[PDB]
Amino acid sequence: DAVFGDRVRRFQEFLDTFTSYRDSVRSIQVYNSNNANILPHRIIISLDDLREFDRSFWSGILVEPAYFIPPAEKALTDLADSMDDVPHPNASAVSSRHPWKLSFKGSFGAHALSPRTLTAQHLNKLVSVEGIVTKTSLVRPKLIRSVHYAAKTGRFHYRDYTDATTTLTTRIPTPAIYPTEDTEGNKLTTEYGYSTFIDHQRITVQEMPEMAPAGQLPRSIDVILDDDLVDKTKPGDRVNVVGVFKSLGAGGMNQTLIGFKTLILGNTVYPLTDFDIRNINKLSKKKDIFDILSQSLAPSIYGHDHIKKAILLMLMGGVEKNLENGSHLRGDINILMVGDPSTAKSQLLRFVLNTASLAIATTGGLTAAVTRLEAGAMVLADRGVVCIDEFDKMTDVDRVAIHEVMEQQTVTIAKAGIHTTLNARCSVIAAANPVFGQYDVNRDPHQNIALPDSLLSRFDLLFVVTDDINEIRDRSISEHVLRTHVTIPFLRKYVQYAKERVIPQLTQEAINVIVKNYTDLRNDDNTKKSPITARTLETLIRLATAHAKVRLSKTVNKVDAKVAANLLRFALL
Amino acid sequence: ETPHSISLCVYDELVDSCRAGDRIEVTGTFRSIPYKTYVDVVHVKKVQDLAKIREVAAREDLYSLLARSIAPSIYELE
Amino acid sequence: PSIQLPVDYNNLFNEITDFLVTFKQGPKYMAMLQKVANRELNSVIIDLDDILQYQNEKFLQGTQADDLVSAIQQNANHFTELFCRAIDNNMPFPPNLTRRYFLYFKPLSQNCARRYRKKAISSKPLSVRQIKGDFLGQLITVRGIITRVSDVKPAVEVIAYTCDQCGYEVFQSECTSEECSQNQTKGQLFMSTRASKFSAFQECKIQELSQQVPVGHIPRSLNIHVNGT
Amino acid sequence: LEGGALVLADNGICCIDEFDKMDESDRTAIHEVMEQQTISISKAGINTTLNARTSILAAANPLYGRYNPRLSPLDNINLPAALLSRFDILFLMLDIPSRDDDEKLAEHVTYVHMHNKQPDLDFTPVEPSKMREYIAYAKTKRPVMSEAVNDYVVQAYIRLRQDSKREMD
């Protein structure tokens, strides 16, 4: 059709008026010329630039991708093959075959959607979907164009294969058995090495449980990956995918529940205010900043200030250290709580899930078991904080396997066959109750909880909390409940700002105090909640770094070590 | 034969000669039909150094030599 | 539709036959053919360094020649039969029914390619994750660990039939030979395994080494077919 | 076959942390790997042997959690003599508090997290890339000792052999 050429010209005009895209192509060509690895034939186009230049073409792509994108594909391919000479004869006949793909970015407006917000009214349109990748399939190539050669004639004839799973518009069904004879009847020769192939993979993007509504079945979408972006995300990755939400097959129109197979032809993959900054920084200048953020951790829960302080430090976290030797160092802080019930053990454990940017609340499966191997509860915890209740209920396998996660922050699969290493950069907080119904302060926590010292001591801070029979505790603990008969969103922004925009580093002045106190701890023979080892020295570094996160400073000062040492003694005495 | 194993074909009066768990010596023809390699079994069996042995048989240190020879890397333990 | 690809096999076949006869070790490959003629050798191991040296000798003398070394790597499936045709043209019913030899190629050595100032790709050790679909039909080297080994299996290539009505042998139910086609009566085709072409076949799965796997993924596997001796 | 921890580590090194927690079905298989470098499996009618050429490096905490100087050493392991006999260079890294030793370790570790270097300035260790080549090259050699030291060994063995009779009691 004639209108197709006009739409092609608009993209050519779009490329002309925005030199950034075409000069980037020229830079890519120069890079390929210097290597004459080869970069793929894909560039990214901003939708905002297209909208500001031609709304109808921009709207046409979103509403009718099959009728507006292929004109852009032809325009880009024609410009690429004509911007330079492509001098090499043999290489030009093969390297220039690949059509130049397009990728999209920018604001999507009404089409910025989720697997649940996406509906059938948006089908056969271009949409952007944000979700979590659940599983993927093996990459396999797609046949695009074949080349035929007759021995008796010595000349080449080419044939194309297209299908609706990769073609934007529904073309006449091409696929068939490979031909054997040409027009003249001469036997043809199958030139495997001159056929063009494109890799293909399907992924299953799902709505996150973090945002799913309660009591409703999930929504998920199938996404097709092609060519160069065929492998960009692993299962569990939070991804943003732009593609043509399109139907397949038939809903029983030919030859009952069978519906049209709606899925997205993915063409782009992206893995996932100033006033808030002017507020977070401003409020930190007062002398009592740290106590403010400790009170706002479940304010209705009375007491337990130090554990709230420890939880906040765990949320801020330390800095994992890497070296040119390839070493990795622990930077996460783990806390375990023990004692008699009815002391808000699970209340604060529940509160952490309500405060962290990402958190997983489960109970004592933890590791990947067997095939893709399912991602265990501790496996899915990367870059998050873990809330486990009934921590005593761990089985023998869980108790012996949690050691690697606790210290190395890594999950190692060593099952029969596949071996792999999975990131487990997670801070673990847990609570437990005595087996014998009541806690005995006359005996150590190892003799009460029945978890081995080799497991209990791995937690940096072990809190033993017991409600005394003293009346003054009973008065306050009951009055605070009866009294019920800086904002939390700001606090969560503060944690988001601190964990990303500031990375504190050590200083010899802090070392002067940290090493001194550890030396005193090793020298002090008085009984304590845990025997002092080198782990406490690492804990002090993490705690001081965690406090530096609160102060929003790239360096470390004396007060950071003073607070870290003081709190550590509290958990030990 | 080894833990591999291949299928065999038996005809005529060679039936009632093999049962599960038996050990067999086979003389037969190797075939292949579409790939399916198999044996046209043609027969089935189910069941100078003599002086050198005598020279060792009548010797005096026979028992010690045989006992020692079994484990040359292991001392004594007669 | 048609397009003129600048690949002239006529020039290449002349170069291949010239390389077979002229390239001295007398000629290395002609001596190998003499060994093959006396059944002393079953596998012809073509060295791509030998062809590259031949091109270098041709280039330094100013003689015109094509870049045969690159062509063989790019379309190695087609050149497998071309080298056989040249070898059959110079060795001391379809020919494949009597060929007792098997053809193999070994890649350019990196020392030689660097010496001749060329970017060898054939000998580069590749992991199955680096093996994209773009490299289909190319000559590549795969580095990994073997996980599965299929046992030796026969593999037919050309099935031979015999017709009692005319005595012709048909190479692939009813005889399609010229005598039976013209005649009103056609003979029945009976398969003959003795004249059929068979090859030894095995299949092996290669798996990525530990250092090749990026963090968070699973070591993929690739299938390898082994044919001949 | 689907390779486990030991089979994958064939012609390599297998590290087993928390070795004291290993079950009897785990440790009994360790005996054959330590002694024979092979694994014999007879299950579901399959009778095969696997190559298990592995170097076993196990690190574990004491049986009673920690070591106190009053405790006898053999009571701090859950392992019988057969496993301890199959080990070589059996270490025992006891931790004893000391103001002159904890100071050095603390200073060593605190410099590791402070700068991207080892605390030593007079010595620069070999980078792993060069270490791998030298170890591989060294591994290619096959030294053979002399008869003089061969007679030396049997004297030193008897020296060490006879002492343990007094030491054990």
Ligand SMILES: Nc1ncnc2c1ncn2[C@@H]1O[C@H](COP(=O)(O)OP(=O)(O)O)[C@@H](O)[C@H]1O
């Ligand atoms: N300091 C406190 N302030 C307010 N409520 C508390 C406090 N301590 C305990 N409680 C109350 O006691 C109850 C016990 O919860 P919790 O101790 O978490 O259960 P469990 O003992 O089973 O873990 C909670 O519902 C909580 O409201």
Ligand SMILES: [Zn+2]
């Ligand atoms: Zn006939």
